Amino acid sequence: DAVEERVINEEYKIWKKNTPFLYDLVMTHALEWPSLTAQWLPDVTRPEGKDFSIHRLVLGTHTSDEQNHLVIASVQLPNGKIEIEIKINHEGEVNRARYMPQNPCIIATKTPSSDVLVFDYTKHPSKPDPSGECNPDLRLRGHQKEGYGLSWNPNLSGHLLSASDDHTICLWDISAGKVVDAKTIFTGHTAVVEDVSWHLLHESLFGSVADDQKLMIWDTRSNNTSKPSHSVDAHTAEVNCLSFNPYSEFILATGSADKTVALWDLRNLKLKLHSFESHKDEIFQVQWSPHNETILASSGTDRRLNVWDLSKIGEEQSEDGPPELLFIHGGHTAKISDFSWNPNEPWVICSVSEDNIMQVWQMAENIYN
Amino acid sequence: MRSKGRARKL
């Protein structure tokens, strides 16, 4: 034990030295506590006469026996400071936080208790109350254990999905600090459900992935909540994440403890389309580019964020990895817990790791052009 | 099922 620390710190030294030719932007910020979660808010402000734009991030804390917070931070990007705008008292670490597309003041969170919380961040003071009391705007009941998966329906305002270690997926309709019981509980998985995500176009369709190694496709119009529409043996270990391609309605991607990202076609789930290989450990997040249909990213325990270009599947080569691996981000020296593609600046990513580091970065233009 | 690390301040 502890030779690893020498290996990591030497590799970080090579990385640091090479950033001027690998990146168009690298901002590093040390949070007071690590964040398990990261999501860019949709808004950008471009003040007249300035050399920067102002973007914003939903973050959380993970403490060891100290008061946690849901956090909104501001980031200045050039055409660059990072500041905390608000902290709201949160009961336990923030497993995951996601804004509601139809009203981005509304943020859902996953707690270490079974509760899923809803905050309207405009209804909370500037400074958190030092009493420490968590006053969520809604408490969403239905789970028996904590989890990670959290998804707002982009086509039905207020329909929230959640995945838990209790083997279940819960659905709430918040549209009517009260307690809401789950509208529907889906019980098809036989193990910890790691992630859940609505389809971006079809208001009734969602996907889940679990430690049973399965990708499941659900339809809310089905009377049978114990059996999905489709059930796919997706990976040879736990499936930790999924993400629907925002330009291609039949395409999705899953990330796994088997160290691979799988590419799927909903119309024929018996045949995995491709397996993206290069991660050296468990994958916990995968996300498609909001700007480029063929671009996907993945991160996890190997301390790397990989960016893939599926248009390069099959091309010939002289190498250090397959042709579809566009970029390896090696800026983190600990496990990466989450990342978010900036929706207003193509190729900007924010990524957060267990050693308190948040990085906002952009690979060099010549790497993708 | 993920196992969260022990968080360190600063």
UniProtKB/Swiss-Prot annotation, chain A:
Annotated phenotype, changing residue 194 to A: Decreased interaction with ZNF827
Primary localization class, coarse: nucleus
Effect of residue 146 to A: Loss of interaction with ZNF827 and loss of localization to telomeres
Subcellular localization(s) per the UniProt record: Nucleus; Chromosome, Telomere
Tissue-by-tissue expression: Expressed in neuroblastoma cells.
Keyword NAD: no
Keyword flag Transcription: yes
Annotated region described as Interaction with ARMC12, given as residue ranges: 1-99
Residue numbers of N6-acetyllysine PTMs: 127
General function of this protein: Core histone-binding subunit that may target chromatin assembly factors, chromatin remodeling factors and histone deacetylases to their histone substrates in a manner that is regulated by nucleosomal DNA. Component of the chromatin assembly factor 1 (CAF-1) complex, which is required for chromatin assembly following DNA replication and DNA repair. Component of the core histone deacetylase (HDAC) complex, which promotes histone deacetylation and consequent transcriptional repression.
PANTHER family linked: WD40 REPEAT FAMILY (PTHR22850)
Protein name in the entry: Histone-binding protein RBBP4
Provenance organism: Homo sapiens
UniProtKB/Swiss-Prot annotation, chain B:
Posttranslational modification: Phosphorylated.
Compartments in which it is found: Nucleus; Nucleus speckle; Cytoplasm
Domains: entry comment: Both zinc finger regions are required for the transcriptional activation of PBX1.
Associated clinical condition: A chromosomal aberration involving EVI1 is a cause of chronic myelogenous leukemia (CML). Translocation t(3;21)(q26;q22) with RUNX1/AML1.
Protein name listed in UniProt: Histone-lysine N-methyltransferase MECOM
Source organism per UniProt: Homo sapiens (Human)
Residues of the full protein shown: 1 to 10 of 1230
